[PDB]
Design a protein around this ligand. Structure first.
Ligand SMILES: N[C@@H](CCCC[NH3+])C(=O)O
Ligand SMILES: N[C@@H](CCCC[NH3+])C(=O)O
Lengths: 471, 471
């Protein structure tokens, strides 16, 4: 905080001297990566006649009488050395360098590209591009200091830079994979008169303009389905959803992909989802043999096994479990395993996750879900009491879901009435039901969180994968 | 509502007969546009041996004894005729067609591609893909009925389909224009502990997980600037912002582009913005001679004039107006023109919009703004009392803004303290100021609303350009 005071004094002194420590422009000719790419093998201790204008954050300084060295680091982490020499710039210029420049300062330098006894610019000219009032921390940054000051994390930790660029490359890879298949990206409302399309409690805000509460969307699904009714063949939306969470490690704001494809079933969207994930790994990561932080390697290449929920649970419990199995039977199994109340569907999913889910290692689709827990998904084409839903588990993590969508408006109203009754202490989404009543062609939806994808591919947590986590 | 009851009866009858009016799948081989593209000139009244599976919404029907014709319309508005003939399908099939199929119903038909005495499929086979419980309206759709039921608007009005696809093509064109220049797209928070980076009242919501109010972002600007400090060279974010409006025709939710570029000034971002807009028109519209709904044509090709606010206002008022001109002088001019209170900057902008702004027709940049109204923009490099801001007016509409960004953390704190004092009845964004104190390289930001862009290019209002406007 004394170092704060001295940097603040240098700013005021620089101003007073008619020097400008926040100039509007410096004439930067090249990024440092550009200069590096244009001199891959310069014979050591040799000079060239490529004059450049570079700019960079001084991350290392090493002074003497007649010659000061610094490492400039460009924003991407590329480095170039500058040398401030009595012979080439003023004695005044050299003294100003020594008096004026601190670690963290952004500096412009103009000069000739050379190699040292290390690629360097021997300066004719330099100025401050931006005076840092706070010194950089060093081996001096806690996990939650990183998240409270991502801007400092990105300056000092190369891994923060690579994670930031990987998320961007992953999101781009997804847009590329879907646009190549003819998906159009749509923008549906964030503020809704009622938030539907998932199981979660909404955030409420007061509209001045309508003197009512509006709800931040929990999911785009009901609006994307209106797009299907409207004649979109292939649609997706990649954007924030909001779940007002209470005792939770799941973030209240997170980026979600949803896709809808007409004249396909959950079987089709299962294939597309595998291909999309494999294409994202190829584009953004460069391999399907994923390196993890424990030094392990997770293979997502080839075909992925599919299992059914009721059969795989039957095999794990050693008895036949079906959509007919009573709640009292299932409650007794749950008790025997040491586990708003008891529902057939909720018990099937809980016992499945507890017995089969925890065991899964290779990438696996589980399909054919209980009707009670899948209000928006079509009843199975041949199997009584299940719906056409899959969940994809990749490296143990619940990653993605796909459905053969319910288009029958009368079944859909019944399912919403069941839900409305069950949480009564009861208005339905009548506009959504109205859209289904105009006719929705058969279609398949998917959902996949971007942070879950990055975690499944890399082992990084939500606190590493989102630029600016809540705090 | 009787037509509702009859459609509902046909659904129940179809179910009872073991027929499925919402089948999970039909085997569609081709889109209708595909079939059209594969038979551009079939000699009229001739048969081919291309069997197809098509599916489409029956938008026109014309029945007889032995032969029923229908127009299927694919989601994109492409049409193909089907012919249901006693000779090729059952007598039973023909009667079921007549009894079972209504306008708005989605129907699959399998058969041979032929031309009529008009491109058609002569059916071997048909089924319902989705039974419509509500008939389509016709010349029967009010402007706010269109917006309350966009899904019906997209079915019946080709222009709704073309506007929906144009917005998507414009947003894609922008991503393409910025990615081609090396801009990375980032995701910054929507929910903030305090909403900054623009002049507007925020929406508030209660966090359960933190028992505090959070604020929906009014702008990404302060987080994008943290990205610049963090070493991003070129960043953009294309996403919703939220302004809690009261007496307003400006929407509470709207999609905004912001871009930031290091080592450029407002002069650089002015060029990029023109090029970006011209590239968007080229990609999404196909011309720079923009057709408007009044039949007029607006030319956005070539170079755009730039004017300065103080000089252009001086010429319009017939006296020299400068950053020194007093509020009392300006108040008197405002009165003479028949116009939380009186500020020098607010009066300059109001008199400029009233005298020069209203006159502009050709695309025009106005630059060099009053310091009081531009708290985040750098003081001008040579002109005392103005900031490096431009506003672009295109076809009379205020479209876009660009700034030479303020990086001086001490000037920035002063400007925030001025604002905080002026609305006191006073906490600053200390984390944002902290980021500037680590050092932000010189950079230029822009802002441009997607609905304003579409309006400036097309003459369409916000109620036409957003898929699902609030209602
Ligand atoms: N709305 C779902 C994703 C789409 C699944 C298919 N309709 C969710 O929040 O998980
Ligand atoms: N935050 C500005 C846009 C960016 C202008 C350059 N910093 C706005 O809401 O208009």
């Amino acid at each position: 905080p004394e170092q704060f005071r001295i940097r603040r004094d240098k700013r005021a002194r620089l101003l007073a001297q008619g020097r400008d420590p926040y100039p509007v422009a410096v004439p930067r000719t090249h990024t440092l990566a550009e200069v590096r790419a244009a001199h891959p093998d310069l014979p050591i201790d040799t000079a060239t006649e490529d004059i450049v204008g570079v700019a960079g954050r001084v991350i290392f300084a090493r002074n003497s009488g007649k010659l000061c060295f610094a490492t400039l680091q460009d924003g991407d982490g590329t480095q170039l050395q500058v040398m401030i020499s009595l012979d080439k710039v003023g004695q005044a210029a050299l003294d100003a360098w020594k008096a004026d420049v601190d670690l963290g300062d952004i500096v412009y330098v103009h000069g000739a590209v050379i190699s040292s006894r290390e690629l360097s610019v021997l300066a004719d000219c330099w100025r401050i591009a931006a005076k840092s009032l706070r010194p950089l921390p060093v081996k001096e940054m806690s996990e939650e200091s990183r998240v409270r000051q991502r801007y400092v994390d990105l300056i000092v930790r190369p891994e923060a830079r690579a994670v930031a660029r990987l998320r961007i490359a992953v999101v781009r890879a997804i847009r590329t994979a879907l646009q190549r298949r003819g998906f159009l990206e749509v923008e549906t409302p964030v503020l809704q008169t009622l938030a539907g399309g998932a199981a979660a409690r909404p955030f409420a805000t007061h509209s001045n303009a309508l003197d009512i509460d509006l709800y931040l969307r929990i999911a785009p699904e009901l609006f994307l389905k209106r797009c299907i009714v409207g004649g979109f063949d292939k649609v997706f939306e990649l954007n924030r959803v909001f779940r007002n969470e209470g005792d939770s490690t799941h973030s209240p704001e997170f980026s979600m992909l949803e896709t809808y494809q007409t004249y396909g079933t959950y079987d089709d969207s299962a294939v597309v989802t595998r291909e999309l994930i494999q294409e994202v790994a190829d584009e953004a990561i460069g391999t399907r043999q994923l390196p993890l932080p424990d030094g392990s390697v997770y293979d997502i290449d080839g075909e992925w096994a599919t299992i059914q929920m009721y059969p795989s649970l039957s095999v794990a419990l050693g008895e036949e479990i079906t959509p007919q199995t009573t709640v009292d039977r299932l409650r007794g199994i749950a008790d025997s395993l040491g586990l708003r109340g008891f529902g057939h569907g909720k018990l099937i999913e809980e016992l499945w996750e507890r017995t089969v889910g925890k065991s899964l290692s290779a990438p696996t689709f589980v399909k054919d879900f209980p009707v009670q827990t899948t209000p928006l998904t079509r009843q199975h084409r041949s199997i009584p009491g299940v719906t056409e839903k899959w969940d994809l588990y990749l490296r143990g993590i619940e990653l993605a879901t796909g459905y053969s969508e319910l288009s029958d408006p009368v079944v859909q109203r019944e399912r919403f009435a069941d839900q409305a009754r069950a949480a009564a202490a009861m208005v339905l989404d009548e506009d959504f039901l109205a859209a289904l009543e105009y006719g929705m062609p058969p279609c398949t939806g998917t959902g996949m969180g971007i942070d879950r994808l990055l975690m499944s591919l890399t082992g990084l947590s939500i606190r590493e994968t989102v630029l600016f986590p809540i705090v």
